[PDB]
């Protein structure tokens, strides 16, 4: 009866240390490990809830459940309903709710699968109906549902699962007794902790390269327990169970399914896509400006300078200091004046110590009744960056209006063109308020998830604290998204352009509202390493607009860290180098000859990439694809990728190997079947100073040369990449002629497209006021198709193309039946570069042979 395989073993004492005795009073099975693995746990025979009256509706199933024994845990609801709603072909959708209680819930020819359900004990059982593989089975565990307390378990595909954000870990998650918890906290990324955001999703890989993906819609803080069998339990401590089934099959399809669900991402300005500086410690307009000057000088591209706690008088939003910050919005002028753009952070605690009438946010806050709440009805209040500080409550729609006005009167001061919205867990200097918090059961639950500091509290507010639409303890998780909605809508009304806002705190559903950064990282080597799994992570979760601070944060970094950091940083969708008060300057600028080459050229391939990554976000906002993608989304069926995590695509066509170690001058990274063209035998132009041609590949790990001042980057045969000349803003960039990069096939095939807009507008895509041109590469031609023209992409100009695999030189090269004034061919590395004179808008035909 307690004959259970020790991998298959569900933990009867998740709640307390336990002893034998007290094990088996629980109705339990104690067996000690040989050597984790729980020692307390559930026999096939513990209580769990039986399904009754089960029934068809048109929608899918109802029925009810029954638990007749109680739990360990307090306040069990004996009576449950299921809803099993089968939505479209791809998507599975289940409640598990209380019928006698509304209980908090957060605000938001035949299917792949197939549906069953265990009687007693009660399971949920999914099949994908293809191949009859069972990729969700609840029966695996009990069910329990207590009032602060619900676990749902599962059976895994494989040993192969990724998600559950936000955590310091490799791509595929550890299946060795692994806790996960979602509690969104301040706290510097490390390993086995919960950080700023919670994503409580997760997409699995079945044998043969099939996927589906799991969202539990639940917002309260949780522990997700990984076991080897293997095995999953969702333990959340408060809620409903919500549960998604996403069928996939492919893992790109997954992500778009999920994506359905939260939202595509939103399109970022172009200029957002473009380097953003910034430190802690420019102390003055003087200095700030100085960066700029610094970074021409020295012919490094800078789109966005940046403005951490520096500009503010006495560290309060909606201010500036009239020292060194006196001249303020005559600096902000002046960068829109040279065609760059501005962000400077944002904190949500607002000073409310200042005397009365002396300080607008909370005087106005104080007024309309913005803030979070404490039992007596007050404002709660605790420490943070000016002192004491009162957290505004971003479900209040009267918060949000509040927070609408502010942004719009300090942009009358100060031409802000985004927001960095920092601290956003929210994030506390103390635990709770100033006035501690109460005693009850939201601040001391029966079942406290694997948190830093062991408690709700640490590093945050009260969870009993109140706010519009419930408890802290059950909206915690939402704090940083509700203020992304708020600010995304507040940049809107007082821009009237596309906004961007980079927050901390994320949810799921985030990446509809603004991006992220990985936070307060160390310039290390193991934490430049850690970026690229964290990056990828993110861009499944549907946040493509995200980077880690380039060169670190905390600590001081090194030359050769700064170089490769650089080279990997230039490939984060989002790119910030970001810097402490206390650290070493660690700008382009700042570093020796060398060094500097190296990194002017990382941001020139950048910059000449950005009509590409453009178009990938074009392609995220509308399709719900990922930017930046792990192998295994682009190649499911080679499961050597499953585990490749230090490399990245940027869509389908660009294979990125960084070095990520000190002292290495050459990398081994994997390679799917196909031909890969070096990206080194495109010409490109920049404004200051800065091997194989082709990989032919069976499926294999290649050591490739790479020294210090090489970033290896390679391009998918049958792909066509557009590119675009140098600037040192994309204001410039952006007028520059185009070029193509076409990797042929072996049959001579390629395939490529360019999406084109004015770059910050609103509502593009519905009013039709953009540019879209498919490019094809048959028979010794390239063509364009015209998908979409529009003033905005019509006088686009097309002056170079390059093909890569030719294998021998042309005689003639017609552009447009007459011969080209140039074309150059090297016999070495198989290339053909063209000159034209062409327009994206105009159909042309370009020929060789
Ligand atoms: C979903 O998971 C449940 C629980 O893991 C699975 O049901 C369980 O299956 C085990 C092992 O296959 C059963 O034990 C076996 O019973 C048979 C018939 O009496 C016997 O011939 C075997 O030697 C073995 O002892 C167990 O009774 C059963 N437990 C429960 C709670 O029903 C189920 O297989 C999974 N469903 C699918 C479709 O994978
Ligand atoms: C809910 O939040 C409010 C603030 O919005 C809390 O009010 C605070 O109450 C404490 C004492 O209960 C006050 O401290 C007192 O300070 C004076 C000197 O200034 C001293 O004479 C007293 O001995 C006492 O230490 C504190 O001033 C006050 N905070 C503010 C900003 O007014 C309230 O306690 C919170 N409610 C609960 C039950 O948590
Ligand atoms: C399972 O359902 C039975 C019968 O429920 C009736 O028919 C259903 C389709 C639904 O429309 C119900 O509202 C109906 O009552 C339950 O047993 C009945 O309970 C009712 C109301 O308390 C009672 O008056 C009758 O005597 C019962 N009828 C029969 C034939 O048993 C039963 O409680 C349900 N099970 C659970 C655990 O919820
Ligand atoms: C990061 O470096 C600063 C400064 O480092 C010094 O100056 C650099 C140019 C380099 O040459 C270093 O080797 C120097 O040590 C560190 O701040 C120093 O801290 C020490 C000891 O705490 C203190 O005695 C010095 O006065 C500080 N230096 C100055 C001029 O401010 C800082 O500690 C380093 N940070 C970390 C965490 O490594
Ligand atoms: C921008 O560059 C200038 C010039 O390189 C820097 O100012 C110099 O700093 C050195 C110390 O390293 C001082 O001894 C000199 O007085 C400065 N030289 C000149 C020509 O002024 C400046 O620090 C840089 N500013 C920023 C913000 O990076
Ligand atoms: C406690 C020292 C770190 C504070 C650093 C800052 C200051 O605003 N707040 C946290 C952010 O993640 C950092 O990017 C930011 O520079
Ligand atoms: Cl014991
Ligand atoms: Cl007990
Ligand atoms: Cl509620
Ligand atoms: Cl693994
Ligand atoms: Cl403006
Ligand atoms: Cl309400
Ligand atoms: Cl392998
Ligand atoms: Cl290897
Ligand atoms: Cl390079």
């Given at each position: 009866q307690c004959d259970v395989p020790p991998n298959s073993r569900f933990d009867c004492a998740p709640d307390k240390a336990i002893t034998q005795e007290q094990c088996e009073a629980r109705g339990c099975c104690y067996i000690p490990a040989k050597q984790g693995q729980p020692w307390c746990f559930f026999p096939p025979s513990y209580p769990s809830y039986k399904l009754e009256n089960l029934s068809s509706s048109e929608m899918g199933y109802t029925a009810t459940l029954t638990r007749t024994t109680p739990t360990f845990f307090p306040k069990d609801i004996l009576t449950l309903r299921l809803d099993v709603m089968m939505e479209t072909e791809n998507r599975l959708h289940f409640t598990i709710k209380?019928?006698?209680?509304?209980?908090?819930?957060?605000?938001?020819?035949?299917?792949?699968?197939?549906?069953?359900?265990?009687?007693?004990?009660?399971?949920?059982?999914?099949?994908?109906?293809?191949?009859?593989?069972?990729?969700?089975?609840?029966?695996?565990?009990?069910?329990?549902?207590?009032?602060?307390?619900?676990?749902?378990?599962?059976?895994?595909?494989?040993?192969?699962?990724?998600?559950?954000?936000?955590?310091?870990?490799?791509?595929?998650?550890?299946?060795?007794?692994?806790?996960?918890?979602?509690?969104?906290?301040?706290?510097?990324?490390?390993?086995?902790?919960?950080?700023?955001?919670?994503?409580?999703?997760?997409?699995?890989?079945?044998?043969?390269?099939?996927?589906?993906?799991?969202?539990?819609?639940?917002?309260?803080?949780?522990?997700?327990?990984?076991?080897?069998?293997?095995?999953?339990?969702?333990?959340?401590?408060?809620?409903?169970?919500?549960?998604?089934?996403?069928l996939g099959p492919e893992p790109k399809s997954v992500v778009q399914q999920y994506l359905d669900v939260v939202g595509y991402p939103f399109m970022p300005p172009y200029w957002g896509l473009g380097f953003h500086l910034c430190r802690w410690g420019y102390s003055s307009t003087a200095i700030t400006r100085q960066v700029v000057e610094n970074m021409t000088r020295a012919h490094f591209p800078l789109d966005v300078q940046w403005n951490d706690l520096d500009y503010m008088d006495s560290r309060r939003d909606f201010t500036f200091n009239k020292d060194?910050?006196?001249?303020?919005?005559?600096?902000?002028?002046?960068?829109?004046?040279?065609?760059?753009?501005?962000?400077?952070?944002?904190?949500?605690?607002?000073?409310?110590?200042?005397?009365?009438?002396?300080?607008?946010?909370?005087?106005?806050?104080?007024?309309?009744?913005?803030?979070?709440?404490?039992?007596?009805?007050?404002?709660?209040?605790?420490?943070?960056?000016?002192?004491?500080?009162?957290?505004?409550?971003?479900?209040?729609?009267?918060?949000?209006?509040?927070?609408?006005?502010?942004?719009?009167?300090?942009?009358?001061?100060?031409?802000?063109?985004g927001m960095w919205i920092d601290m956003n867990e929210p994030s506390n200097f103390i635990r709770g308020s100033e006035d501690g918090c109460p005693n009850n059961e939201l601040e001391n639950p029966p079942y406290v998830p694997g948190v830093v500091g062991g408690t709700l509290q640490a590093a945050t507010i009260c969870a009993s604290s109140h706010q519009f639409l419930s408890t802290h303890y059950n909206l915690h998780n939402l704090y940083g998204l509700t203020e992304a909605i708020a600010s995304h809508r507040a940049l809107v009304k007082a821009r009237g352009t596309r906004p961007f806002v980079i927050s901390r705190s994320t949810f799921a559903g985030h990446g509809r509202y603004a991006g992220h950064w990985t936070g307060d990282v160390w310039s290390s080597w193991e934490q430049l390493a850690s970026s690229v799994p964290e990056i990828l992570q993110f861009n499944l979760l549907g946040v493509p607009l995200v980077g880690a601070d380039v060169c670190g944060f905390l600590g001081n970094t090194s030359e050769e860290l700064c170089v490769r950091w650089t080279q990997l940083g230039a490939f984060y969708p989002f790119m910030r180098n970001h810097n402490s008060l206390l650290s070493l300057p660690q700008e382009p600028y700042s570093?020796?000859?060398?060094?500097?080459?190296?990194?002017?050229?990382?941001?020139?391939?950048?910059?000449?990439?950005?009509?590409?990554?453009?178009?990938?976000?074009?392609?995220?906002?509308?399709?719900?694809?990922?930017?930046?993608?792990?192998?295994?989304?682009?190649?499911?069926?080679?499961?050597?990728?499953?585990?490749?995590?230090?490399?990245?695509?940027?869509?389908?066509?660009?294979?990125?190997?960084?070095?990520?170690?000190?002292?290495?001058?050459?990398?081994?990274?994997?390679?799917?079947?196909?031909?890969?063209?070096?990206?080194?035998?495109?010409?490109?132009?920049?404004?200051?100073?800065?091997?194989?041609?082709?990989?032919?590949?069976?499926?294999?790990?290649?050591?490739?040369?790479?020294?210090?001042?090489?970033?290896?980057?390679?391009?998918?045969?049958?792909?066509?990449?557009?590119?675009?000349?140098?600037?040192?803003?994309?204001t410039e960039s952006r007028q520059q002629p185009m070029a193509l990069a076409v990797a042929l096939t072996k049959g001579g095939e390629a395939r490529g497209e360019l999406f084109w807009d004015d770059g910050e507008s609103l509502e593009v895509l519905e009013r039709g006021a953009y540019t879209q041109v498919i490019f094809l590469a048959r028979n010794n031609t390239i063509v364009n198709e015209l998908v979409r023209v529009t003033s905005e992409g019509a006088g686009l100009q097309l002056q170079k193309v390059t093909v890569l695999g030719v294998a021998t030189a042309p005689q003639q090269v017609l552009s447009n039946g007459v011969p080209v004034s140039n074309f150059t061919y090297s016999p070495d590395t198989k290339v053909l570069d063209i000159c034209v004179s062409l327009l994206m808008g105009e159909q042309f035909l370009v020929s060789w042979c």
């Open positions: 209380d019928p006698a209680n509304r209980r908090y819930e957060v605000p938001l020819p035949s299917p792949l699968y197939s549906v069953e359900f265990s009687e007693e004990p009660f399971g949920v059982i999914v099949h994908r109906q293809l191949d009859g593989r069972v990729l969700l089975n609840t029966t695996v565990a009990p069910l329990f549902f207590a009032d602060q307390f619900l676990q749902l378990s599962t059976s895994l595909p494989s040993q192969y699962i990724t998600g559950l954000a936000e955590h310091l870990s490799p791509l595929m998650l550890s299946t060795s007794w692994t806790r996960i918890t979602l509690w969104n906290r301040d706290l510097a990324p490390t390993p086995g902790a919960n950080l700023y955001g919670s994503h409580p999703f997760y997409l699995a890989l079945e044998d043969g390269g099939s996927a589906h993906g799991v969202f539990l819609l639940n917002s309260n803080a949780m522990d997700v327990v990984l076991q080897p069998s293997p095995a999953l339990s969702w333990r959340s401590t408060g809620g409903i169970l919500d549960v998604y089934i996403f060194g910050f006196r001249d303020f919005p005559a600096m902000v002028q002046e960068l829109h004046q040279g065609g760059r753009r501005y962000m400077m952070i944002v904190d949500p605690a607002i000073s409310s110590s200042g005397p009365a009438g002396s300080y607008r946010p909370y005087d106005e806050g104080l007024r309309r009744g913005v803030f979070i709440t404490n039992e007596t009805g007050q404002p709660l209040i605790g420490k943070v960056w000016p002192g004491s500080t009162a957290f505004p409550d971003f479900t209040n729609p009267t918060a949000l209006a509040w927070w609408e006005d502010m942004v719009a009167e300090f942009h009358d001061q100060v031409p802000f063109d570093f020796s000859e060398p060094a500097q080459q190296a990194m002017r050229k990382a941001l020139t391939l950048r910059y000449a990439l950005l009509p590409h990554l453009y178009t990938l976000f074009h392609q995220a906002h509308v399709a719900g694809e990922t930017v930046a993608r792990p192998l295994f989304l682009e190649f499911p069926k080679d499961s050597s990728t499953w585990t490749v995590d230090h490399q990245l695509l940027w869509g389908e066509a660009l294979l990125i190997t960084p070095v990520l170690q000190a002292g290495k001058a050459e990398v081994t990274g994997y390679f799917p079947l196909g031909t890969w063209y070096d990206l080194q035998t495109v010409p490109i132009e920049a404004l200051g100073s800065l091997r194989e041609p082709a990989i032919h590949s069976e499926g294999q790990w290649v050591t490739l040369p790479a020294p210090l001042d090489t970033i290896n980057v390679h391009l998918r045969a049958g792909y066509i990449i557009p590119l675009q000349g140098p600037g040192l803003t994309t």
